[PDB]
Design a protein around this ligand. Structure first.
Ligand SMILES: O=C1COc2c(CCNCCN(C(=O)CCNCCc3ccc(Cl)c(Cl)c3)C3CCCCC3)ccc(O)c2N1
Ligand SMILES: C[S@@+](CC[C@H](N)C(=O)[O-])C[C@H]1O[C@@H](n2cnc3c(N)ncnc32)[C@H](O)[C@@H]1O
Ligand SMILES: [Zn+2]
Ligand SMILES: [Zn+2]
Ligand SMILES: [Zn+2]
Length: 429
């Protein structure tokens, strides 16, 4: 197993991870090497396919020209996994489009063939033991899994010996239940991976640990003091949202309702859905209508980013914020969601001033809605610092970068390469 920790039966939460020794804020509980991992398509050329090192001058694979490495060693070591895609990418050309879930699942199947025995990534929980929620699958989810199975056969039949369709549905469901996104210091999506021992941890909206990445290695650090006998919890979702929103997401993606202190007390719900202090106060039904409108625009915008222009996307943000502002305060989470989306569009358009304008409005309400040590808060401070630095506002940039560092020292560790980069940004000016 893992020193100072153990697998146990968590009442009403299946299997979980329990502490056997105290952990202080910032302590590393454990590390978990990726069992299977894939670099996201849009990050190719920026990070090494094998070790995820972000570097300039990465060497391109000579055959496909769509895989980049540190050197010949990273190239060689990645070959058992890269071979699943190398020739297929050149053969299918423009038609090569398997989803990231399918890409990861192909790598799980390849790893099971090469290494059927328990790996150092499975000291407490094995990939084969993963919870699937197969019995809870509705028609919509089974149809999505069937599309994924067809893409798997379509793009990965060369090297893989497929189990029956029934075993594949269990696998795709286990991957959705237990799969991780690997994010960078700005929470930008890098890829997807399987960390079996990390997937043993249950969810809480007031977590006592944070998962970070050092290349393809997952690291688990305490963000609250943990005592012997206490269960180790991480957050599976974005904690900005009120209780109902959080539980709608947990029920849909993880088939459970959270009963943590935040979900039971609903303490932060009032400030999260802050209402304007108007002479004629807004009616209860007028609030409920705006909350319904707010959830609908969030989904409308989510769809729109796939086909609308940057100006159309900014229009949706501006127009929706205007309608919401008649009922909602600026610190309200639905206002903040649109502002964050608008900042993202500005960043893409390289409208640094516009991005800074939004980020400045988001930061204080983020600090109040998120937990004490939050990667969402650290990431926003970091973006702000980088925008300030890029726009020659060095004193403001240094202050924001140091706010990011203070959180990251706890979550990523004092010695994390990301902190060394940020300190170099402060020093280089
Ligand atoms: O064990 C875990 C896993 O989740 C955690 C997370 C969430 C990170 N993973 C997010 C990426 N991801 C998903 O969210 C999959 C959810 N699928 C959406 C709805 C759905 C659910 C079930 C099925 Cl059946 C299907 Cl059809 C569709 C997947 C996208 C595809 C690649 C794999 C990840 C954070 C901290 C954690 O500690 C955990 N712990
Ligand atoms: C990644 S697994 C965590 C390990 C899991 N308990 C097991 O036995 O394999 C995610 C699943 O654990 C359960 N789970 C996680 N957190 C929970 C919580 N706070 N309350 C109830 N169930 C939870 C749900 O069934 C969820 O889909
Ligand atoms: Zn490398
Ligand atoms: Zn190649
Ligand atoms: Zn909760």
């Amino acid at each position: 197993g893992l020193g100072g920790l153990e697998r146990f039966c968590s009442p009403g939460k299946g299997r979980g991870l329990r502490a056997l020794q105290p952990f202080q804020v910032g302590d590393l509980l454990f590390s978990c090497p990726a069992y299977a991992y894939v670099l996201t398509v849009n990050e190719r050329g920026n990070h090494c396919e094998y070790c995820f090192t972000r570097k300039e001058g990465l060497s391109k694979c000579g055959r496909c020209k769509q895989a980049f490495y540190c050197n010949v060693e990273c190239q060689k070591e990645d070959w058992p996994m890269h071979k699943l895609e190398c020739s297929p990418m050149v053969v299918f050309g423009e038609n090569w489009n398997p989803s990231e879930t399918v890409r990861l699942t192909a790598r799980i199947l390849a790893k099971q063939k090469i290494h059927p025995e328990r790996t150092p990534s499975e000291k407490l929980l094995a990939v084969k033991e993963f919870e699937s929620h197969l019995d809870k699958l509705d028609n919509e989810k089974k149809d999505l899994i069937q599309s994924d199975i067809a893409a798997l056969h379509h793009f990965y039949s060369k090297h893989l010996e497929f189990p029956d369709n029934d075993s594949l549905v269990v696998l795709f469901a286990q991957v959705n239940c237990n799969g991780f996104t690997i994010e960078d210091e700005e929470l930008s999506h890098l890829g997807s991976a399987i960390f079996p021992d990390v997937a043993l941890m249950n969810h809480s909206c007031c977590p006592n640990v944070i998962v970070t990445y050092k290349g393809t290695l997952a690291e688990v650090r305490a963000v609250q003091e943990i005592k012997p006998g206490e269960e180790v919890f991480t957050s599976y979702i974005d904690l900005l949202y009120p209780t109902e929103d959080r539980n709608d997401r947990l029920r849909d993606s993880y088939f459970f309702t959270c009963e943590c202190q935040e979900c039971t007390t609903k303490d932060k719900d009032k400030a999260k859905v802050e209402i304007r202090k108007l002479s004629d106060p807004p009616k209860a039904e007028a609030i409920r209508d705006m909350v319904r409108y707010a959830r609908n625009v969030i989904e409308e915008f989510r769809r729109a980013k796939h086909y609308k222009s940057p100006s159309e996307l900014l229009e949706i943000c501006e127009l929706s914020q205007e309608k919401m502002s008649s009922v909602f305060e600026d610190s309200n989470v639905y206002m903040l969601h649109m502002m964050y989306q608008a900042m993202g569009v500005c960043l893409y358009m390289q409208d640094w001033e516009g991005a800074l304008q939004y980020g400045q409005k988001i930061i204080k309400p983020y600090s109040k809605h998120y937990p004490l040590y939050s990667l969402n808060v650290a990431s926003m401070w970091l973006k702000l610092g980088r925008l300030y630095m890029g726009l020659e506002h060095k004193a403001a940039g240094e202050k924001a970068l140091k706010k990011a560092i203070a959180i990251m020292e706890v979550a990523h560790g004092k010695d994390h390469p990301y902190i060394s980069e940020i300190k170099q940004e402060i020093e280089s000016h």
